[PDB]
Structure formats: structure tokens, C-alpha cells
């Protein structure tokens, strides 16, 4: 009630501040305590701060002229919380997979995806700057927060799945793994982006871009969109029977993937391109006008 102007040291009533009575001008200790209500014993309103301050106002009624007491007819909030202010925050468990389960039918707002895309790629630039190796990064290792922020976690099998995990982390359809994974080579910027490139298409479709069985068969689905050449555009690190993959044309990503704006179709096609050296870096894609 009183108009606060200054501050008294910290003690029983915490940070006791100092006010003046809006009407009489009398000074007062702006004492404060946290305020709950009931407990395990039922409701309430456990003894009584609800009249403790009445004591303090009773002391004011006595005017006993040495009664520093709590301001106004309530246990005023003058820096409350015991007294002691403390914060605690919740971890976000909103898995990208959950996002997609909560997401709408094929044609997921390209602009939303653009924002999440550039967040992802920006995250990658950091990860590439820190040489973070994680060819095993899959949709479920991507966190999408309630504020619409992409966060990356679980950087490769070396430090993940320390507790109960999948029995087919690799056997499962690897439609989200780069050809370089399917070729049994290694991790690279293009590998990472190939993975998420399909994920981005999944986001647009709310449904995996490709879906094969074996690594070669998975490529057999991949090739249907990006196109296929014979054994003359294959990398050295190839475990798959390169050259035994009958050549075929590409299928305009723009038309295949729902709401895939041509600029993003180009970025995706570049991310999906079989040859890792014909792909686009996270930085280049990040800085592309599409995003």
C-alpha cells in the first residue's frame, strides 16, 4: 500500500524495502515473505502469516514505539519468494519426429521449413567449424522447440545410445542416410546435408522422401529423384557394386516434394545429388536467398 522509495538490508523478511504511507507519510519496513496457501493437511488460506502481519499491524496500532513492522494489512510482495528468488527451467522434449506427427499433411508451410532449415544449417556451420562428426544424425536427433528452434544432438554412435536403443539402427530403412553412408565411406558436410535434405523433404511431405531395403536398394530409390549415372560419377570409397546401377533421369524435386519452391528444390537436389562433391555446403545453403 505504501509508496516504496528505498531499501532496507536483507534479513528475516528478506529484502526489506522502505516506503511511505500514501496518506500519512509514515515510513515503513517493506517486509516480505513467500506466499503459498494450503498443503498435505488440506486447504487453508499451517499456522498464519495471514495474521502475522496482523501482528505487525497490531504493533503499529500500539505505536510500543520500537516496532519495525511489515507494511500494510497484507504480507506484501517486496521481493518475495521466502525470501529468495530462484528459477528452474524445463527441458524441451519436442522431437522432430513428434513435430512431424503434430505437423499437417503434405505441403508443410515452406516458410516454416525455411526457418527451421536455416536454423539447422546454421547449427551445422557451428558443427563444421568444430569438426563435429555425426553421419549417424537422423530425424529423431533433431529437436524442434515450442519457439520453433532447431537444436541438434547425438553426434554419432560413439557417444549416443548409452541406454536401451534400437536393434536395427542401420538395418532400418536408411532413407535419411547419405549415399556415402550407403557406400560405407565416411562423414562429411555433404553427408550431413544429404541426410537432412531428405528430412526437409519429409517435412514438406510429412513423409520420408525415399524408402528402400538394402543400401543399394536404398540408392535405387534415391536415384529415381536425383538421377543416375554408370561407373564414371562414383567416389572411390564404394562398397556397393557401382556400375551395376542402370542409369536413369531425375524427377524435378520441385514437383515431387509438396510446396517445394524451385530455389529450395535446387538446394535439395544439390543436397541429394549422389556425388558428395556436387553438393552444396551448409554455409552456402544457409546463405542462399531461399532462406
Amino acid at each position: 500500500r505504501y509508496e516504496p522509495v528505498a531499501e532496507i538490508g536483507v534479513g528475516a523478511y528478506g529484502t526489506v524495502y522502505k516506503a511511505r504511507d500514501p496518506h500519512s507519510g509514515h515510513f515503513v519496513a517493506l517486509k516480505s515473505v513467500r506466499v503459498p496457501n494450503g498443503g498435505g493437511g488440506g486447504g487453508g488460506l499451517p499456522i498464519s502469516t495471514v495474521r502475522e502481519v496482523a501482528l505487525l499491524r497490531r504493533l503499529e496500532a500500539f505505536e510500543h514505539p520500537n516496532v519495525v513492522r511489515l507494511m500494510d494489512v497484507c504480507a506484501t510482495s517486496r521481493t518475495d519468494r521466502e525470501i529468495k528468488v530462484t528459477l528452474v527451467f524445463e527441458h524441451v522434449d519436442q522431437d522432430l519426429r513428434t513435430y512431424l506427427d503434430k505437423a499437417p499433411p503434405p505441403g508443410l508451410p515452406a516458410e516454416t521449413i525455411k526457418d527451421l532449415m536455416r536454423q539447422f544449417l546454421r547449427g551445422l556451420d557451428f558443427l563444421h567449424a568444430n569438426c563435429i562428426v555425426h553421419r549417424d544424425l537422423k530425424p529423431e536427433n533433431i529437436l524442434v522447440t515450442s519457439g520453433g528452434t532447431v537444436k541438434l544432438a547425438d553426434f554419432g554412435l560413439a557417444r549416443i545410445y548409452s541406454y536401451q536403443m534400437a536393434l536395427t539402427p542401420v538395418v532400418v530403412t536408411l532413407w535419411y542416410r547419405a549415399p556415402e553412408v550407403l557406400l560405407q565411406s565416411t562423414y562429411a558436410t555433404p553427408v550431413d546435408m544429404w541426410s537432412v535434405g531428405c528430412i526437409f523433404a519429409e517435412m514438406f511431405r510429412r513423409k520420408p522422401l525415399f524408402c528402400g531395403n538394402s543400401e543399394a536398394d536404398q540408392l535405387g530409390k534415391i536415384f529415381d529423384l536425383i538421377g543416375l549415372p554408370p561407373e564414371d560419377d562414383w567416389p572411390r570409397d564404394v562398397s556397393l557394386p557401382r556400375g551395376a546401377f542402370p542409369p536413369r533421369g531425375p524427377r524435378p524435386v520441385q514437383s515431387v516434394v509438396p510446396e517445394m519452391e524451385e530455389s529450395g528444390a535446387q538446394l535439395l537436389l544439390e543436397m541429394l545429388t549422389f556425388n558428395p562433391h556436387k553438393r552444396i555446403s551448409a554455409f552456402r545453403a544457409l546463405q542462399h536467398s531461399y532462406l
Binding site: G9, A12, V16, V33, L55, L143, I160
Partner: protein, 259 residues
Amino acid sequence: VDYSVWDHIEVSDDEDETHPNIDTASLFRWRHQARVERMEQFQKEKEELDRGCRECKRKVAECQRKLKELEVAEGGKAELERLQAEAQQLRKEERSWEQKLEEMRKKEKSMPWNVDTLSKDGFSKSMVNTKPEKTEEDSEEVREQKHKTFVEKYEKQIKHFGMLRRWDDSQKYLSDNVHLVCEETANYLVIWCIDLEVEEKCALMEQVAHQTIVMQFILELAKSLKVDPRACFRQFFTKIKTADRQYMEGFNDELEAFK
């Protein structure tokens, strides 16, 4: 004048090197892993280079023994020359393994500092303060010495408490002067009030009496809770800031009775 020795410290959990789109809960774990893998690779390499060096060393050492033997051999000097060249190559190989080891030494010099390279566990000694042996002292015998010297030692400080009025100042005061939370203090305050009455200092007497019952209040529920008053005096100011008008006045009534 030169602290460059600490310009290359690597910290795997460095929270000042993070990113908005990265979950560092696992990134830091990745960094740990990378550090370990790199050390394993480094150590492997060094050992293999050392091995190779020692092998070529032994090979040329034995060849040199053989060179002496071929020199001695009656016509073995033709073979000697052949072996000399081979021994030279073995020495050159040894050398190149050592040159690689020198490069490993250079790599060690370039190595980042961390909890495994900066230092070792020079000394560690734990201790849990269990005890000091279930016992008990006669508080009257303690008082006989304490009341007489403690009160005089802290007489002014006891009086300073008696001169307080704000509930918060009383808490902080005893928080700073925890050794004053006892009966000897309260007893002085009672005696002091009597002396103040005699000296016609009733205004002060009344305030001292207020603080007298504050110390008595601390003693009151400390006994009820079966705990050392100094361990819970802060809960009396917590109780005071929380207890009902009717019941805190009732606690003040019980308090006045306790005194």
C-alpha cells in the same frame, strides 16, 4: 612476462563456446570423445614409430656387427661393401623413424593443455566429520567458567543485541554473532534490564526486554526441538515473520512465561 605456456588449453565442457541450434548436453560429450580418440591415435602413432626405429636400430646394429665380421672374413670384404650399403639404408631408415619421432615431439609441444596433461592428483585426502564421540558435559560446570568470562568478553555485544528492534537486524546480528545464541546471553539481558530499571533507563529497559524475550524465544523451541539454538535461531525469525497475530502473541505469552 611470459604466460604463453597457457595459451593453448582445451576444455571439452567449455560452456562459453556454444550455439543456439546445438544441444551442448551431448556436444560436450562429443568433445570428450574426440579428445580421447585423438590421444589414442597419437599414442598409437608414437609407439609404432618408436617400434620401427628400434627395429631398424637393431637391424643396423647387427649389420654393423656383421660388417666387422665381413671385414675380418678372408675375402668377405666384397660382401662387406654390399652390407655397408644395406646397413647405411637401415641407419637411414632408423633415422627417418627418429625424424618422425622428432615430429611427434613437435606434436607434443603443440598439444593442448587439459586435465590429463596439465596436472596429476598430487594429493588427495578426504575426511568425514563423524563423532566427536557420544558424550555430554555438565552445563552448570561449563556455565561456572563460561557465564563468568564469556559474558564479560562479549558484554558489549550482548548489549548491542539488546539495543536492536528490527526483526531483520536481529536475525543478521545473530547470524554474524552466532556464538551469542545462548542462555548466558539471555541471563545478562535480564540482569541488564534490572540495572536499567535502577538507573531509570526504562525506555532502553523495555527494548532490552523485547530482545531478551527474542533470545529466550530462540532457546524455547530449540529445547522443544532438541537442537542446538545456534543451529536453528534463524528459524525463529522465520517463525516470527510467519506466526499468527493471535498465536504469535500467544507465542509471546508462552515466551514471556518461558523467560
